[PDB]
Design a protein around this nucleic acid. Sequence first.
RNA 1: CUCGA
DNA 2: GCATCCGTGAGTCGAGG
DNA 3: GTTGTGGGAGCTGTCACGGATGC
Lengths: 180, 45, 49, 195
Amino acid sequence: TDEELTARFERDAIPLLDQLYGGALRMTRNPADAEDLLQETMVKAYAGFRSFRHGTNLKAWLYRILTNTYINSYRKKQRQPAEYPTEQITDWQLASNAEHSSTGLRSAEVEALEALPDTEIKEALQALPEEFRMAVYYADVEGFPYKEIAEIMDTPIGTVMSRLHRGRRQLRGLLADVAR
Amino acid sequence: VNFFDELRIGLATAEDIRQWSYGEVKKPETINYRTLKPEKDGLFC
Amino acid sequence: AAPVTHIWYFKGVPSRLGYLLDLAPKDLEKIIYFAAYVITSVDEEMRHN
Amino acid sequence: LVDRYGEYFTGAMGAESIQKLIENFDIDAEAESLRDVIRNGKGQKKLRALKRLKVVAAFQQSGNSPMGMVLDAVPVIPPELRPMVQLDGGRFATSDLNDLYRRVINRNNRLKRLIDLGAPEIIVNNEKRMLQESVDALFDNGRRGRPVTGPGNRPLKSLSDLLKGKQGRFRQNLLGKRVDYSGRSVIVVGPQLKL
RNA sequence: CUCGA
DNA sequence: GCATCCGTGAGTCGAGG
DNA sequence: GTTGTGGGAGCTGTCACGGATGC
């Protein structure tokens, strides 16, 4: 009865899990972490209890199991990476993070002005014929594929790409001194 | 439009909790330490 | 993996769970945190037979 | 009582137990049988009746099935409301929430793995109690038992902490906020001023 | 944490 | 029959590190 | 894969009050 040789584990191993707790709590410094560790150790020991020799000391086996499980926990915690809890991340921390982010904490002013039109580039675009400029739009600003540009333009691909070249040349002419 | 008429509470049934959700998180992993990218199915997935 | 009581309604004095099932809060705790079994339902006909 | 008679009744410990007790619960029956005894007599038993009736009558007239009080699925708040950042030093800071959620999710996965491994009933019962305790922490940490502590033995700010107190959501962010087009400075008497 | 009204 | 045990209140706004 | 000996930090100088609970 291999299922009976497991219930015998339920008779012997269960009692000592109390002192196993005591020890794991002395190890982890935290009650909840001690409970998590005790459960992990019990799972590890029960899964491969076939390796437990009958009639021999079982407390030391589970003790080494718990110590090794704690070592594995720390090894996995090395690359946590370094998470710390706080009741609230501070404005200092938020701004200091924005000091290295892709986009900073933006202002209502920044947003509202961004919404406004860039007169220089708007004037440089209004110069080109609205066909070649519509093409440079569908191709550069929006990034459509040239096939989709030909589709939405109702024109062949060659005309679309020729308008693209001519308009890019023109606007680089007017926007070269502007770009800088 | 800031012209609501009433605001009401009630215990949420698991049905409401799942209708709200956009997916269930499964792992304790949060972000990839190296690439600073959210681990999938984690608390930041 | 297993249901959980909303601690607001168990530990929230007066225990809403208690008043709803007419159970003493201490017994309700014994039940919820696995220090005592509770009888879900009894088959009275089979017992009588 | 299980070795014999086991086929005749059903019993168990845990939250599933309370879920069942709530299922096999006639709300109208309890409400009216409590009204009968509330008008029957008067005294401590009548006070018990009135109190235990308020909640049952709310559950009756509200259309809120008491089943809600037991949860089979927990909701997770958007990450932006429990943000994560890194400070000078490569170390990371996160909201307490994230840590409580992480404990809940870890213990839930461990309970699943135990149920699969068909482990002793006592081990799975321990895991279920730990799951209940961790969800209680996630919701109203400190309310039952010892609060969950982070480094420095700081009780983590549970989800209830976000609404309570002078520095909770209501008093600190709804009844008063920080505004733009504002400034501060030290004042000095100007006598030449008009009122 | 210390300090200002 | 109530005595305890617990759980809730306990000023505002400002500056650093 | 774990097989010789095994109970942790924490309050811990607050007060005044009202109402479940619990013997």
